[model samples]
Target: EIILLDYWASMYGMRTRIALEEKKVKYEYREEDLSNKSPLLLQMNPIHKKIPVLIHEGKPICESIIQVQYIDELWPDTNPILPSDPYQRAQARFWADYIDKKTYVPCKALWSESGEKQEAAKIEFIEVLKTLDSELGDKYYFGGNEFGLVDIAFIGFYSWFRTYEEVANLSIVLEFPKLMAWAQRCLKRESVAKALPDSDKVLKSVSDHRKIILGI
Candidate 1:
């Protein structure tokens, strides 16, 4: 049996769900409230107390990236995520790693800060988006014609673009048109469309989150 413990709005959790859907794996999804985490989640990932824990045959797997890799390895005959070639797989891993290294801090600040700090983060984040867009130039997917590891790794963040723009008062469409187009292309897949939460609902959650955390 396959089971995933996750929160609906979590980008990381979305990654695991997308991977599962892409592989056409049927899994039970148990949503978690981080404020009141379930004992199963704690038991599954004792060190992290995090969601996106993939439980296969009662064995738990922690971390979103690792879970995606696990799902891919477990179902190699289905939609392949990581490439078969050694060097190409390494390249895919590199770009996915790059997304992780670059996204979080600026993304957090885009909603959570005010004044100069927020402005600075906005500028920095746009530059990051442009760099990614340039890398993706004229390719149907980050892995070229195939929807592979790099696409799975980064597409979840697209769900947050509306939220980020709403909070930051900026236009991703205006600044990163190619990136926006790429995201719309990703959305055409059933796996991506099904796994991503409704954009408006995601924006509401972000608004609620900002009020709770920043009182703004």
Candidate 2:
């Protein structure tokens, strides 16, 4: 069986988990304690030392989106999670890459930072969400009628939106109703429900982190 070394609280790891679930690939799930580095983890992802290292057979594939694509390729006939049309596939990649560039840092800034920088992060973060909402429009998912690549790429961050809301002192639902509705739709999927951690749990974890970093 394949083995996945990951941390439960990680959004990136959550994405990897969801991708595997979507593909119906069975694997050994090992939760890594970030404070205590594992020898296997160091061996697998020596460069970044990151969680979500997917060990298949013997070799390991690092990075969440990369692993998602790898899983999609390896199990092409399983459910065909990615779009078939070349242009649509290219478009899906664009949105997935866009999410990677836009999502994480600003949300982190809102919680661990303050004053001018924090405000800027909040502004940029909301703009990113707004752009995504516009991209979503009346579509069921980011790509089209089906839940595929971009949806998998972005859905993990939905788990963190609440934590960002409390720290940034804003409402994602009120601001981007369409986006929230889309997120809720994703949550209804069995794969998403199994993979994504609870938002309140994320909020609680963020609160603990806020104390450590902000000393509040």
Candidate 3:
């Protein structure tokens, strides 16, 4: 049995869903309440105690980045996230790592903090995205002309883009037109469209979370 313990709005978890859908894998999805995690999730991922744990058969796979790769390797005959060409595969991995390391904290700070720090984070966040945009160039997706690992890794953040805009008073679409265009192209895929939470829903939840974090 394939079981995934995930939080509904988690960007990381969204990758696995997209990967699974792209591979046309039928898996049982269990949405976890992160505030009160399940015993299964704790048992599956005792070390990190995080959601987005993928249980295949009886074993567990931790980390979304690794999880999707595992899925790709396990079901390689179908849609592949990593390119077959070794160099292309390496390129995809590099950009996925870049997105994983660079995007999260600064993106979170845009909604979760205030004043100078928020402004600073917003600036850095824009720069990070701009860097990704330049890397994208005129390609149809991050990994050349087709969607793959890097696109899956970074596309989830697009769902939260509007939330960041509303919180920080910035227009992401205008600031990074190429990036926005790429994001829309990714969204056209069924896996991506179905996997992501509505931006409106995310905005509501994040607004509440920011208020809680700021004690406002």
Candidate 4:
């Protein structure tokens, strides 16, 4: 049996769900409360002891990106997440790594601290958004005509990105008509629809978290 250990609100955990949905793979989802983690999570990822551990037939694979690749390897027939071309695959990996290392960090500050730090983050965030737009060109996804590796990496961030935009009081991608339309197009997929949380809910959660943190 395929079982996914997850925390619904974690963007990292959502990556696995997106991959599984894209492949149309059926699995048992075990929701975990991070404050009180399950022993299963520990056993699955002994080192990190984190969520998003995919257990397939008694074996475990940890880390969301690696787990997505593992899923692609396991079921390559339905929806292939990786490109067969080694060069293309490396290119896709490059952007995904860039997003992880750069984009999300600055974006997180828009919802995190306040004042100068948040403003600096907002600037960096828009700069990267523009960079992503330039990288996109006239493509349907990062892979040009196909929904492949980069899309898998980005799928979970769609709705949450909107929330981030709202929290920052910024208009980056929303101002880019093509990018907005592209995001809408991505959402039309059944897997993306299923994997993403409702925007209203994510916004509410973000609001509550920010209020609590600021003691407002």
lDDT string, candidate 3, 54-157, tens digits: 99998999999999999999999888789999998898889888887876666667887888888898888888888998999999899888899999999998
Q: Could you tell me which 10 consecutive residues in candidate 1 have the lowest summed lDDT? A: 99-108
lDDT tens readout by residue for model 4, 63-161: 788898899998999888889899998998898888777755566787777788889988887776777788888889887888877776766766677
Task: List all candidate RMSDs to the true structure.
Answer: 1.7, 1.5, 1.4, 1.9
Ranking by lDDT: 3, 1, 2, 4
Record all residue pairs in model 4 with backbone atoms less than 3 Å apart, i.e. clashing.
none
- If both were scored by TM-score, which would come out higher, candidate 2 or candidate 4? 2
TM-score of each: 0.92, 0.94, 0.94, 0.91
Q: How does model 2 fare in lDDT?
A: 0.85
Q: Return model 3's CA RMSD, one decimal.
A: 1.4
Write the candidate numbers in order of decreasing TM-score: 3, 2, 1, 4
Error of 1 at 21 (Å): 0.9
Whole-model lDDT for model 3 versus the true structure? Answer: 0.90
lDDT of 2 by residue, 1-216 (tens): 799999987888888898888888789999999889899999999999988999999899998889988999999887677798899888888988887777666556777787887898888888888888899999998867888888888888888888888877867868888888888899998999999988999899889887897786
Worst 10 residues of 3 by lDDT: 100-109
lDDT of 1 by residue, 32-129 (tens): 98889999999999998878899999999998888999999999889988999999999988888787777655556787777788898788877778
Off by over 4 Å in 4: 104-106
Cα lDDT of candidate 4 equals 0.81
Candidate 3, superposed: residue stretches over 4 Å from native = 213-216
Q: What value does the lDDT take at residue 162 in candidate 1?
A: 88
